[PDB]
Structures are given as structure tokens and as C-alpha cells.
Symmetry: none
């Protein structure tokens, strides 16, 4: 025992759990999502997973988002794709359109309309 | 492989009742208010950002030690907090046992939670 | 393939690798270090390990820095301050005594460390 | 268990700029940033190496893809960079196949390792 409390996983309701999970895994460079029960499961590096679940309702309102921390080099590579592919993006969590500046950030939506953010935290930030 | 989830926003009816309850259930400080959020920081480089304005089997799950599980579950039971062994809230009154223990419950905003040891 | 380059481990030369590794593991709440070859191994959460190696022979502002919740920070710094462990607010050890937080200190081998927070 | 992360570590070298520039270009990383007394090389797993102005078997080791190993090893071999299969630099001109992966050690005189696991 004696560990400190961790966030281990959270369920995110989206219009299409498979479109959402595939988009997120492919954009962030993660392996193919796993199917578990009603969920499409995406594991992140800091001992936490996102479990996408089908939900036809509204789903996520700004300034809600899930934010992913990546290196400056991965930020440049993902943002370059988030530009050639016509992904809408915003500099702020309230969505402005067309990045944030210690660190950088950019916000965008997945195919289900789930709000995302990629952000950096370089040394000296 | 290296990407981390740094923070996630959780929509609740009242961000302050939810965050304050969770921090005192989990032995965390008094939450910090940042922008429109009530912030709960966890140990694994991630925070939950509660925001004003939960459908089963959705939940937020926390991995904790066996000793903190015993203490939180004791609080739940002595405090009369409804709890279930399953994410569908179909098995009230019990915990579950994958080499670990787990139990599901709701916070005062009706948000679904889970604590687990494995 | 296609992963991005990661720092997987680094070897740190100290007077006593076992005193250093056990001190570090017990202070940061990590499991007991493992012995591998000539090294005492401490694994951290972000897929990187420190391998301590015995060396008769760290200078400021050099250090190894560990990121923790503020809050385990309060718990570890509580140990540092109540236990009389010398500490400084700066990497040059010119400010003894003591957004995010940080504090610098030495392990029993004289290896320079830092614990730091990065809250939302 | 464990949640503590290694966020940065300072590496002592004769010339911080030669080391950081060499490593970033060899590993396919962007240009290093200079901050205070350090030359900063950021890696993907929420950690940075801070070079500041090394004895075998000490080294710094990088986990990389199979494809990046081929490109770095190609640079090493076509570029004449001395390399060894072992951390003691006793097996020159060889790579290791540890754990089904591939690995090689080399000097920049600071000791490095790349591995694919
Ligand atoms: Fe963990
Ligand atoms: Fe989200
Ligand atoms: Fe954010
Ligand atoms: Fe939740
Ligand atoms: Fe769960
Ligand atoms: Fe319920
Ligand atoms: Fe890794
Ligand atoms: Fe160090
Ligand atoms: Fe530092
Ligand atoms: Fe991290
Ligand atoms: Fe090194
Ligand atoms: Fe090595
Ligand atoms: Fe050599």
C-alpha cells in the first residue's frame, strides 16, 4: 500500500466511440484502441486511460476538454497535421481560431465533437 | 507511448460540492479554484477540473492503496453512502474483488465514481 | 515502430550507490531499488530509470529533478525540514531555507537533487 | 506504487553546445534550446537532459524505434563513428541483440546508448 491517490481512468461520452478513439490514437501516436465492454479504451503514459462510450446526446461543452501533454517536437508534428487536414483549431479553451504561447497549446475537436487540447511544458516554462 | 493526460474537465451540477467532497473523501487538500474550475490534483501528473453545468456506466476511477481503500470504504459505510460493486449500480451493498478490490458510488452532484486497488 | 525518442536510463556516479538508491527510493516513496550488474536501479514513472554506480571521486548547479504532486511535495518537504536535511531554494545552493514549488537538497553521497511541482 | 517522474537531469560535459547539437541531430530532434547555464535536449517522455560545461560503464541511454535505430546506425556506420555492443566499450564494431531488440553504445567523449527493446 501507501501509494498516493491516482486518477486511473475516466469514461468520456461521445457520438461515436470508435471514430473518437481511432482519431485520438492515430493523432497522438498511440496503438489501436482496445474494446472492453461498451468502451473503446485508450491508454496514456501516466497510468491513466480514457474510455470512450457511445452517446447520441450533446456531449462536451466549451470550455470543457481533455488535455494531452507532449514534447515540443510532437506538438510541431501533430499541429502540422492539424492544419493540412483542415481540423478546426483554437488558441483558447473557449474557442481565437487559427496557437497559445511557458509552453504552447492548441485546442481542437475530434470527429464526435469531443474537445481536445495538446500542450507542452518544456524546461524553463 | 509517451503521451500523458495532463488534465480533464468534468461537468457537474455544482463544481464546488463535487470537488470538496472528493478531496475530503480521498484525503486530498481543499481544492483550488482556477478560472471556472475547481481543481483536484492527483499523484500521477494529472488533475480533474470540475466545472458547473452522470450517465451510467460512466464514471471517474481512482487507484488507491489497500489502506486508503479500507479507510474510504469505512467512511462510506459509516456515513451511509450508497455504493455498488458494479459500474451499472445494479449490485448495491457490496464491493467487488482482479487481484484487487473496487467499489462504485456517487458524489453529491450525482457524479459517478470508482475506487480500486488493482 | 515510429515511437519518439525517449530517455530510458542514465548512470549516476556516487560514493555509495546503495546508500544513495535506498535514500532516494525511501524519500520519494518508490519501491526498494534493484541490483543490476554494478548498478543500483531506481525506476521512475515516466519510463526512465536512474542507475547508481559506486565511484570514489556532483557539483552545483548540477542536479536530478523529480516531479511530484505539490502535495506529496508538502509531505516530502515535511520530512526534509523536520529531519534536518540541509536544503536550498536554488540550484546553486546559495539560498538555504526554502505557480509551482521547488526545493534542492543532497543525498548521503552528495548527489544533488530537486523535488518540484507543476500544478494546473 | 510509483507516480514520481524524472523531469530533468543535468549532464556534465566538456562542451555543452557540441554535445547537445550532436545528439539532437543524431537522434532526429529539433535544435536544442539554451537556458541559463544549460543546453536543453527534450525527449518524448516528459524529461529533458540539461548539458552543462563521464567514466565507463556510465552512459545515457535512449529508447528508440526500430526505424530510427536503422537510421542512426546507418549514420554511425557510414559516418565512421566508433561504436560498441557493450557498455564497457570492449566489443567494437558490434551491436547487441538484448531482449530481442537491438542496441549499440557510442561516444559523442560522453557515453551514450541507443536501444529498441
Ligand atoms: Fe500509477
Ligand atoms: Fe474530454
Ligand atoms: Fe487545458
Ligand atoms: Fe466522471
Ligand atoms: Fe472503472
Ligand atoms: Fe447510481
Ligand atoms: Fe516509453
Ligand atoms: Fe543527478
Ligand atoms: Fe531543476
Ligand atoms: Fe509527466
Ligand atoms: Fe550521460
Ligand atoms: Fe544502458
Ligand atoms: Fe569508449
Amino acid at each position: 500500500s501507501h501509494m498516493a491517490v491516482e486518477l486511473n481512468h475516466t469514461i468520456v461520452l461521445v457520438k461515436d466511440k470508435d471514430a473518437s478513439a481511432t482519431f485520438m490514437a492515430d493523432l497522438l501516436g498511440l496503438p489501436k484502441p482496445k474494446e472492453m465492454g461498451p468502451f473503446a479504451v485508450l491508454q496514456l503514459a501516466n497510468d491513466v486511460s480514457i474510455l470512450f462510450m457511445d452517446f447520441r446526446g450533446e456531449g462536451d461543452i466549451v470550455p470543457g476538454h481533455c488535455a494531452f501533454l507532449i514534447s515540443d517536437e510532437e506538438f510541431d508534428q501533430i499541429f502540422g497535421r492539424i492544419r493540412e487536414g483542415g481540423i478546426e483549431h483554437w488558441a483558447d479553451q473557449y474557442h481565437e481560431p487559427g496557437i497559445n504561447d511557458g509552453g504552447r497549446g492548441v485546442y481542437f475537436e475530434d470527429p464526435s465533437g469531443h474537445n481536445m487540447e495538446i500542450m507542452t511544458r518544456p524546461y524553463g516554462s
